[PDB]
Tab-separated table of C-alpha atoms and ligand atoms in Angstrom:
chain	number	residue	atom	x	y	z
A	267	UNK	CA	-32.684	103.151	110.140
A	268	UNK	CA	-30.888	103.523	106.805
A	269	UNK	CA	-28.663	101.557	104.981
A	270	UNK	CA	-25.069	102.151	104.674
A	271	UNK	CA	-24.366	99.294	101.820
B	169	UNK	CA	9.390	105.354	121.952
B	170	UNK	CA	8.487	103.759	118.332
B	171	UNK	CA	4.727	103.195	117.620
B	172	UNK	CA	3.135	100.594	118.183
B	173	UNK	CA	1.522	98.268	115.734
B	174	UNK	CA	-1.232	95.772	116.149
B	175	UNK	CA	-0.552	92.553	114.544
B	176	UNK	CA	-0.594	88.870	114.407
B	177	UNK	CA	-1.107	86.273	111.500
B	178	UNK	CA	-4.120	85.427	113.000
B	179	UNK	CA	-5.793	88.531	113.718
B	180	UNK	CA	-5.504	89.838	110.513
B	181	UNK	CA	-7.078	86.293	109.041
B	182	UNK	CA	-9.800	86.987	110.950
B	183	UNK	CA	-9.988	90.474	110.182
B	184	UNK	CA	-10.147	89.169	106.601
B	185	UNK	CA	-13.617	87.268	107.002
B	186	UNK	CA	-15.663	90.475	107.502
B	187	UNK	CA	-18.161	90.223	104.617
B	188	UNK	CA	-17.900	93.785	103.173
B	189	UNK	CA	-13.986	93.741	103.085
B	190	UNK	CA	-13.018	90.164	102.238
B	191	UNK	CA	-9.006	90.085	102.396
B	192	UNK	CA	-8.721	94.040	103.031
B	193	UNK	CA	-6.530	93.496	106.526
B	194	UNK	CA	-4.411	90.955	104.431
B	195	UNK	CA	-3.947	93.998	101.781
B	196	UNK	CA	-2.959	96.368	104.151
B	197	UNK	CA	-0.285	94.410	106.536
B	198	UNK	CA	1.232	92.950	103.506
B	199	UNK	CA	1.897	96.819	101.632
B	200	UNK	CA	3.072	97.817	105.201
B	201	UNK	CA	5.377	95.100	105.319
B	202	UNK	CA	6.055	95.376	101.848
B	203	UNK	CA	7.499	98.747	102.395
B	204	UNK	CA	8.880	97.281	105.595
B	205	UNK	CA	7.474	99.687	107.901
B	206	UNK	CA	6.951	96.802	110.614
B	207	UNK	CA	10.490	96.796	111.233
B	208	UNK	CA	10.250	100.639	112.729
B	209	UNK	CA	7.163	100.159	115.083
B	210	UNK	CA	6.655	97.784	118.044
B	211	UNK	CA	4.508	94.546	117.051
B	212	UNK	CA	2.373	93.577	119.369
B	213	UNK	CA	-0.171	90.873	119.655
B	214	UNK	CA	-3.314	91.658	120.404
B	215	UNK	CA	-5.252	90.170	123.250
B	216	UNK	CA	-9.072	89.125	123.012
B	217	UNK	CA	-11.949	90.862	124.342
B	218	UNK	CA	-13.578	89.348	127.490
B	219	UNK	CA	-17.533	89.438	127.694
B	220	UNK	CA	-16.584	91.762	130.867
B	221	UNK	CA	-14.830	93.882	128.783
B	222	UNK	CA	-17.055	93.940	125.825
B	223	UNK	CA	-20.355	93.930	128.455
B	224	UNK	CA	-19.223	97.551	129.871
B	225	UNK	CA	-20.671	99.556	126.918
B	226	UNK	CA	-22.527	96.420	125.006
B	227	UNK	CA	-25.757	94.953	126.681
B	228	UNK	CA	-25.932	91.018	127.539
B	229	UNK	CA	-29.002	91.029	125.210
B	230	UNK	CA	-26.989	92.155	122.673
B	231	UNK	CA	-24.134	90.129	123.156
B	232	UNK	CA	-26.074	87.121	123.865
B	233	UNK	CA	-27.769	87.175	119.988
B	234	UNK	CA	-24.579	87.928	118.661
B	235	UNK	CA	-23.076	84.781	120.323
B	236	UNK	CA	-25.568	82.702	119.255
B	237	UNK	CA	-26.520	83.485	115.568
B	238	UNK	CA	-22.375	83.398	115.546
B	239	UNK	CA	-21.845	80.206	116.546
B	240	UNK	CA	-23.288	78.506	113.362
B	241	UNK	CA	-23.584	81.733	110.845
B	242	UNK	CA	-27.050	81.729	111.035
B	243	UNK	CA	-27.964	84.528	108.848
B	244	UNK	CA	-31.732	83.706	108.940
B	245	UNK	CA	-32.864	84.174	112.946
B	246	UNK	CA	-36.090	85.900	113.021
B	247	UNK	CA	-34.346	88.245	116.112
B	248	UNK	CA	-31.595	89.781	114.198
B	249	UNK	CA	-33.759	92.636	112.966
B	250	UNK	CA	-34.130	94.214	116.424
B	251	UNK	CA	-30.385	93.792	117.163
B	252	UNK	CA	-29.691	95.369	113.358
B	253	UNK	CA	-28.242	92.276	111.876
B	254	UNK	CA	-29.307	91.350	108.082
B	255	UNK	CA	-27.883	93.044	105.041
B	256	UNK	CA	-25.451	95.454	106.158
B	257	UNK	CA	-24.442	93.631	109.254
B	258	UNK	CA	-24.742	89.738	108.513
B	259	UNK	CA	-24.381	87.042	110.492
B	260	UNK	CA	-21.171	85.505	109.306
B	261	UNK	CA	-19.885	82.337	111.324
B	262	UNK	CA	-17.556	83.369	113.795
B	263	UNK	CA	-18.513	87.050	113.397
B	264	UNK	CA	-18.593	87.157	117.496
B	265	UNK	CA	-15.020	85.754	117.507
B	266	UNK	CA	-13.981	88.163	114.846
B	267	UNK	CA	-15.518	91.260	116.451
B	268	UNK	CA	-14.323	90.674	120.109
B	269	UNK	CA	-10.600	89.745	118.633
B	270	UNK	CA	-10.863	93.255	116.924
B	271	UNK	CA	-12.304	94.941	120.118
B	272	UNK	CA	-9.244	93.436	122.382
B	273	UNK	CA	-7.324	94.847	119.387
B	274	UNK	CA	-7.953	98.216	120.203
B	275	UNK	CA	-8.041	97.686	124.077
B	276	UNK	CA	-4.856	96.375	123.805
B	277	UNK	CA	-3.614	99.753	121.885
B	278	UNK	CA	-5.434	101.902	124.658
B	279	UNK	CA	-3.190	99.965	127.459
B	280	UNK	CA	0.151	100.235	125.348
B	281	UNK	CA	-0.594	104.249	125.634
B	282	UNK	CA	-1.604	103.851	128.837
B	283	UNK	CA	1.426	102.127	129.808
B	284	UNK	CA	3.929	104.462	128.466
B	285	UNK	CA	4.927	101.725	126.122
B	286	UNK	CA	4.672	104.325	123.230
B	287	UNK	CA	3.378	107.645	121.984
B	288	UNK	CA	1.315	106.434	118.973
B	289	UNK	CA	-0.620	102.767	118.727
B	290	UNK	CA	-2.130	101.120	115.457
B	291	UNK	CA	-5.245	99.016	115.440
B	292	UNK	CA	-5.910	99.263	111.094
B	293	UNK	CA	-8.689	96.424	111.567
B	294	UNK	CA	-10.603	98.995	113.948
B	295	UNK	CA	-12.315	101.887	113.729
B	296	UNK	CA	-16.258	100.376	113.900
B	297	UNK	CA	-17.849	103.465	114.924
B	298	UNK	CA	-21.359	102.827	113.947
B	299	UNK	CA	-22.441	99.794	116.601
B	300	UNK	CA	-24.491	100.987	119.351
B	301	UNK	CA	-24.702	99.033	122.594
B	302	UNK	CA	-27.512	96.891	121.739
B	303	UNK	CA	-27.306	97.277	118.105
B	304	UNK	CA	-24.851	96.404	114.900
B	305	UNK	CA	-25.133	99.086	112.119
B	306	UNK	CA	-23.162	99.876	109.299
B	307	UNK	CA	-20.949	96.749	109.124
B	308	UNK	CA	-19.992	97.283	112.577
B	309	UNK	CA	-20.652	94.686	115.630
B	310	UNK	CA	-18.955	95.707	118.447
B	311	UNK	CA	-17.684	99.252	118.510
B	312	UNK	CA	-13.852	99.043	119.397
B	313	UNK	CA	-13.320	102.544	119.249
B	314	UNK	CA	-15.785	103.048	122.602
B	315	UNK	CA	-14.133	100.399	124.142
B	316	UNK	CA	-10.243	101.601	123.110
B	317	UNK	CA	-12.031	105.215	124.838
B	318	UNK	CA	-13.324	103.602	127.369
B	319	UNK	CA	-10.116	101.650	128.233
B	320	UNK	CA	-8.314	104.897	127.939
B	321	UNK	CA	-10.316	106.882	130.649
B	322	UNK	CA	-8.584	104.894	132.999
B	323	UNK	CA	-5.687	107.225	132.883
B	324	UNK	CA	-6.501	109.816	130.284
B	325	UNK	CA	-8.748	112.146	131.770
B	326	UNK	CA	-9.982	114.202	128.627
B	327	UNK	CA	-10.032	112.321	125.149
B	328	UNK	CA	-10.807	113.356	121.976
B	329	UNK	CA	-11.951	111.098	119.175
B	330	UNK	CA	-11.541	112.334	115.722
B	331	UNK	CA	-13.913	110.469	113.038
B	332	UNK	CA	-12.545	111.288	109.235
B	333	UNK	CA	-14.052	108.482	107.762
B	334	UNK	CA	-17.020	109.273	105.037
B	335	UNK	CA	-19.802	108.653	106.899
B	336	UNK	CA	-20.528	110.188	110.952
B	337	UNK	CA	-19.339	108.474	113.875
B	338	UNK	CA	-22.725	107.940	115.604
B	339	UNK	CA	-22.124	105.221	117.633
B	340	UNK	CA	-19.312	106.630	119.177
B	341	UNK	CA	-20.877	110.106	119.780
B	342	UNK	CA	-24.376	108.596	120.727
B	343	UNK	CA	-22.111	106.585	123.486
B	344	UNK	CA	-20.215	109.811	125.204
B	345	UNK	CA	-23.347	112.128	124.102
B	346	UNK	CA	-24.226	112.756	127.866
B	347	UNK	CA	-20.306	113.432	128.991
B	348	UNK	CA	-18.202	115.919	128.553
B	349	UNK	CA	-15.182	113.557	129.330
B	350	UNK	CA	-14.951	112.572	125.725
B	351	UNK	CA	-15.320	115.236	122.822
B	352	UNK	CA	-16.482	113.482	119.617
B	353	UNK	CA	-15.566	115.220	116.431
B	354	UNK	CA	-16.370	113.870	112.986
B	355	UNK	CA	-16.292	115.121	109.724
B	356	UNK	CA	-18.571	113.207	107.205
B	357	UNK	CA	-20.718	113.357	103.820
B	358	UNK	CA	-24.506	114.655	105.230
B	359	UNK	CA	-27.055	114.540	103.089
B	360	UNK	CA	-30.273	113.018	103.296
B	361	UNK	CA	-30.872	109.644	102.281
B	362	UNK	CA	-27.006	109.283	103.064
B	363	UNK	CA	-26.060	106.750	105.757
B	364	UNK	CA	-26.302	107.219	109.083
B	365	UNK	CA	-28.708	110.133	108.685
B	366	UNK	CA	-27.636	112.204	111.468
B	367	UNK	CA	-24.311	114.600	112.275
B	368	UNK	CA	-25.681	117.902	111.508
B	369	UNK	CA	-23.783	120.703	112.919
B	370	UNK	CA	-26.827	121.611	114.966
B	371	UNK	CA	-25.837	118.286	116.570
B	372	UNK	CA	-23.918	118.623	119.935
B	373	UNK	CA	-24.698	116.364	122.639
B	374	UNK	CA	-26.870	116.184	125.298
B	375	UNK	CA	-27.333	116.985	129.193
B	376	UNK	CA	-23.948	117.480	130.707
B	377	UNK	CA	-22.492	116.612	127.339
B	378	UNK	CA	-23.963	119.667	125.425
B	379	UNK	CA	-21.664	121.044	123.124
B	380	UNK	CA	-19.064	118.115	123.456
B	381	UNK	CA	-19.865	116.806	120.536
B	382	UNK	CA	-18.814	118.418	117.484
B	383	UNK	CA	-19.917	117.736	113.617
B	384	UNK	CA	-19.104	119.157	110.478
B	385	UNK	CA	-21.346	118.226	107.824
B	386	UNK	CA	-19.609	118.194	104.004
B	387	UNK	CA	-21.047	117.562	100.610
B	388	UNK	CA	-19.933	115.380	97.641
B	389	UNK	CA	-16.129	116.036	96.083
B	390	UNK	CA	-14.230	117.953	98.672
B	391	UNK	CA	-10.556	117.306	97.562
B	392	UNK	CA	-7.462	117.744	99.964
B	393	UNK	CA	-6.708	121.278	100.477
B	394	UNK	CA	-10.151	122.657	101.106
B	395	UNK	CA	-10.636	119.462	103.932
B	396	UNK	CA	-7.238	120.351	105.211
B	397	UNK	CA	-8.247	123.946	105.924
B	398	UNK	CA	-11.938	122.583	107.654
B	399	UNK	CA	-10.131	119.994	109.792
B	400	UNK	CA	-7.568	122.763	110.948
B	401	UNK	CA	-9.627	124.922	111.573
B	402	UNK	CA	-11.875	122.807	113.611
B	403	UNK	CA	-9.175	121.186	115.371
B	404	UNK	CA	-7.358	124.098	116.623
B	405	UNK	CA	-10.823	125.450	118.125
B	406	UNK	CA	-11.295	121.987	119.739
B	407	UNK	CA	-7.726	121.601	120.764
B	408	UNK	CA	-7.584	125.077	122.471
B	409	UNK	CA	-11.207	124.752	124.130
B	410	UNK	CA	-11.393	120.993	125.213
B	411	UNK	CA	-7.377	120.608	126.332
B	412	UNK	CA	-7.521	116.634	125.781
B	413	UNK	CA	-5.039	114.276	127.039
B	414	UNK	CA	-5.614	111.584	124.809
B	415	UNK	CA	-6.826	111.195	121.167
B	416	UNK	CA	-8.568	108.217	119.297
B	417	UNK	CA	-8.287	108.853	115.455
B	418	UNK	CA	-10.342	106.986	113.174
B	419	UNK	CA	-8.883	107.269	109.270
B	420	UNK	CA	-11.530	105.294	107.204
B	421	UNK	CA	-10.438	105.326	103.349
B	422	UNK	CA	-14.220	105.385	102.461
B	423	UNK	CA	-13.237	109.347	101.483
B	424	UNK	CA	-10.270	108.373	99.002
B	425	UNK	CA	-11.035	108.809	95.200
B	426	UNK	CA	-11.901	105.712	93.686
B	427	UNK	CA	-13.878	104.290	96.328
B	428	UNK	CA	-17.518	102.271	94.839
B	429	UNK	CA	-18.983	104.857	97.407
B	430	UNK	CA	-17.805	107.815	94.802
B	431	UNK	CA	-18.582	110.463	97.113
B	432	UNK	CA	-15.712	112.687	98.589
B	433	UNK	CA	-12.470	113.348	96.505
B	434	UNK	CA	-9.672	112.758	98.611
B	435	UNK	CA	-6.011	111.622	98.435
B	436	UNK	CA	-4.031	109.715	101.613
B	437	UNK	CA	-2.036	113.125	101.148
B	438	UNK	CA	-4.679	115.528	102.330
B	439	UNK	CA	-5.411	112.899	105.155
B	440	UNK	CA	-2.140	112.879	106.104
B	441	UNK	CA	-1.789	116.654	106.519
B	442	UNK	CA	-4.865	116.203	109.066
B	443	UNK	CA	-2.849	113.382	110.772
B	444	UNK	CA	0.326	115.584	110.716
B	445	UNK	CA	-1.455	118.045	112.786
B	446	UNK	CA	-2.858	115.745	115.282
B	447	UNK	CA	0.493	114.147	115.967
B	448	UNK	CA	2.345	117.520	116.662
B	449	UNK	CA	0.237	117.633	120.032
B	450	UNK	CA	2.684	114.805	121.128
B	451	UNK	CA	-0.682	113.349	122.722
B	452	UNK	CA	-1.161	109.570	123.092
B	453	UNK	CA	-3.007	108.751	120.025
B	454	UNK	CA	-5.034	105.551	119.420
B	455	UNK	CA	-4.802	105.081	115.075
B	456	UNK	CA	-8.113	103.148	114.141
B	457	UNK	CA	-9.184	102.000	110.326
B	458	UNK	CA	-12.760	101.928	109.049
B	459	UNK	CA	-14.548	102.144	106.361
B	460	UNK	CA	-12.495	101.778	102.502
B	461	UNK	CA	-14.156	99.717	100.045
B	462	UNK	CA	-11.661	100.132	96.964
B	463	UNK	CA	-9.211	97.586	98.857
B	464	UNK	CA	-6.101	98.218	96.890
B	465	UNK	CA	-6.840	102.019	97.579
B	466	UNK	CA	-7.464	101.738	101.569
B	467	UNK	CA	-4.311	99.263	101.652
B	468	UNK	CA	-2.395	102.653	99.567
B	469	UNK	CA	-3.909	105.151	102.206
B	470	UNK	CA	-2.902	103.318	105.465
B	471	UNK	CA	0.381	102.443	104.625
B	472	UNK	CA	1.488	106.109	103.180
B	473	UNK	CA	-0.397	107.070	106.638
B	474	UNK	CA	1.543	104.668	108.783
B	475	UNK	CA	4.745	106.226	106.633
B	476	UNK	CA	3.723	110.049	107.994
B	477	UNK	CA	3.628	108.366	111.757
B	478	UNK	CA	7.339	107.080	111.208
B	479	UNK	CA	8.359	110.552	109.389
B	480	UNK	CA	9.226	108.150	106.487
B	481	UNK	CA	9.023	109.379	102.527
B	482	UNK	CA	7.846	106.477	100.918
B	483	UNK	CA	8.985	105.356	97.428
B	484	UNK	CA	6.049	105.619	94.957
B	485	UNK	CA	6.388	102.344	92.847
B	486	UNK	CA	4.553	99.384	95.157
B	487	UNK	CA	7.075	97.170	95.921
B	488	UNK	CA	6.534	93.349	95.138
B	489	UNK	CA	4.660	91.539	97.566
B	490	UNK	CA	1.898	89.028	97.853
B	491	UNK	CA	-1.095	91.488	96.180
B	492	UNK	CA	1.130	93.064	93.985
B	493	UNK	CA	-1.175	92.578	90.876
B	494	UNK	CA	-4.099	94.513	92.533
B	495	UNK	CA	-2.082	97.691	92.157
B	496	UNK	CA	-1.263	97.235	88.328
B	497	UNK	CA	-1.306	98.744	86.008
B	498	UNK	CA	0.726	101.577	87.168
B	499	UNK	CA	1.955	100.175	90.461
B	500	UNK	CA	2.524	103.499	92.304
B	501	UNK	CA	1.248	104.519	95.955
B	502	UNK	CA	-0.358	107.848	94.527
B	503	UNK	CA	-4.021	108.265	94.128
B	504	UNK	CA	-5.210	110.540	91.779
B	505	UNK	CA	-8.669	112.687	92.610
B	506	UNK	CA	-11.715	112.014	89.830
B	507	UNK	CA	-12.409	114.811	87.520
B	508	UNK	CA	-16.076	115.796	89.336
B	509	UNK	CA	-17.495	118.545	90.907
B	510	UNK	CA	-16.248	119.907	94.557
B	511	UNK	CA	-20.145	120.869	95.882
B	512	UNK	CA	-19.338	122.759	98.906
B	513	UNK	CA	-19.551	126.479	98.418
B	514	UNK	CA	-17.470	128.878	100.649
B	515	UNK	CA	-20.169	130.271	102.370
B	516	UNK	CA	-21.731	127.065	103.979
B	517	UNK	CA	-18.303	126.075	104.832
B	518	UNK	CA	-17.720	129.404	107.084
B	519	UNK	CA	-21.212	129.320	108.426
B	520	UNK	CA	-20.238	125.825	109.600
B	521	UNK	CA	-17.145	126.818	111.222
B	522	UNK	CA	-18.165	129.996	112.862
B	523	UNK	CA	-21.143	127.819	114.357
B	524	UNK	CA	-18.866	125.106	115.668
B	525	UNK	CA	-16.549	128.496	117.051
B	526	UNK	CA	-19.854	129.581	118.850
B	527	UNK	CA	-20.584	126.146	120.115
B	528	UNK	CA	-16.781	125.710	121.778
B	529	UNK	CA	-17.393	128.989	123.542
B	530	UNK	CA	-19.207	127.351	126.217
B	531	UNK	CA	-16.508	124.129	126.517
C	71	K	K1	-16.486	110.859	109.957
C	72	K	K1	-19.307	114.235	124.401
C	73	ZN	ZN1	-17.202	104.524	106.411
């Protein structure tokens, strides 16, 4: 999981 | 006949409430109206997606969670993290109903295409390609692109999804990873640490869908000419190999110079050339928005692209309208690229293109 933001 | 434009005042007002893009839907519609483009389109009121429609992709547990936190805008629910709600995707009051409206709007566009009402149907407030079956992601709560594709599958046998947003269209790719009825093609920034972190050229789908996902990883600073060269080369090969019957095209404007993400360096003219290439196939085409965080530039971009769909040349001067002051001090439609480097090396682009060509031989 990544942050967009 | 003439393109369908999915619109109602109530729909725009719902879309204006999305946390990361407040007022954007009104700015986009207002500018399209100011250029009088709506008078050249068939305006169709969107229907709201039913629970049964939403559940053909999204899980019951996720839909139930979203509905629960949406009711009073509980952005502090302890279970929101399992379901992807949090910073990127806050539990804005009403977001379940707003997302159901956007999903319904894309489904409505798809149904218009199936019914032969039009060859092009537009939902500029759709394009939320990151949402997963059981997870909000990337400012996306319900995946309207997937819902639209699943509606098109009623008639159109083979469907091409093309995603020109800055970010990898991962939720759509994942939804169709194991099937060959839908080919996904995404051009996007690909660099470790950059959201969502997926979509290398070696990502080609899985199982019976192997080779039916195409990813074109691009570096910062790409401009119109090189981008179109890449996009045309890939789409030419995809079209010949896959023979699509319908296209869903996501045109997120977060690639455009001036976006605060400050990654690609495109103008609407470059994206417009990609759009023109797709339109000349003369297939049922569903047009979606997506990202775009310089709001006035996103409106400039999508207004210009609406003009491309209509075969019209628009005046450079921004017409008077509700948001006229947002376009100052120059008040023009055109966007100028930033003076920064293009980090895309010709040998790397060629190798990516060659790798894709080799993949498509299997199709
Ligand atoms: K993309
Ligand atoms: K696929
Ligand atoms: Zn994006």
